[PDB]
Design a protein around this ligand. Structure first.
Ligand code: HEM
Ligand code: NBE
Length: 151
């Protein structure tokens, strides 16, 4: 469980991400897709994108970045009490999208790498630590739904 102080650091930096949900989304997906090309293959929607320039120019990618960061923000603002928000995500991602839990680790690294670029002053190592912890709690809870479902 995160402390109240840890939550405040998390949600402080997230309030900032939300100045530009779309721009954050782009940076995060593109970092994921370049660092972990296997991830891009899970998306029939996006696997025609063969360069970073093409990814950056994709309005549909941008659109989907917002869908993702919107869901994550909702989850983070529950400060651990995210059961309702997490059940549908775990279901669709295990059984329909076929996403390994390992890939949640990779997007966690991407989120941290980007939150870093765009809000250094509000993402010192204390806030980085808190954000790590929050993303780890999320992954743990997803992992247990996965195990339930046989994935
Ligand atoms: C922070 C982690 C994540 C969040 C919050 C998230 C959120 C979402 C949401 C809200 C949707 C649409 C609704 C649904 O189908 O359930 C979605 C769809 C999807 N997600 Fe994720 N996701 C996450 C991680 C990942 C990762 C790491 C991958 C792949 C490596 C992935 C692959 C997909 C795919 C393939 C779809 C279907 C998209 C389409 O073609 O339209 N997700 N995600
Ligand atoms: O659509 N869900 C995604 C979440 C994170 C990265 C890429 C896609």
């Amino acid at each position: 469980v995160l402390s109240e102080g840890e939550w405040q650091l998390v949600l402080h930096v997230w309030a900032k991400v939300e100045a530009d949900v779309a721009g954050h989304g782009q940076d995060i997906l593109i970092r994921l897709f370049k660092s972990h090309p296997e991830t891009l293959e899970k998306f029939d929607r996006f696997k025609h994108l063969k360069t970073e320039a093409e990814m950056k120019a994709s309005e549909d990618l941008k659109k989907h970045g917002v869908t993702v960061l919107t869901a994550l923000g909702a989850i983070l603002k529950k400060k651990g009490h995210h059961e309702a928000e997490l059940k549908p995500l775990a279901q669709s991602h295990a059984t329909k999208h076929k996403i390994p839990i390992k890939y949640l680790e990779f997007i966690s690294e991407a989120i941290i790498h980007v939150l870093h670029s765009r809000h250094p002053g509000n993402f010192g190592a204390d806030a980085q630590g808190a954000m790590n912890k929050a993303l780890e709690l999320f992954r743990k809870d997803i992992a247990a739904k996965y195990k339930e479902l046989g994935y």
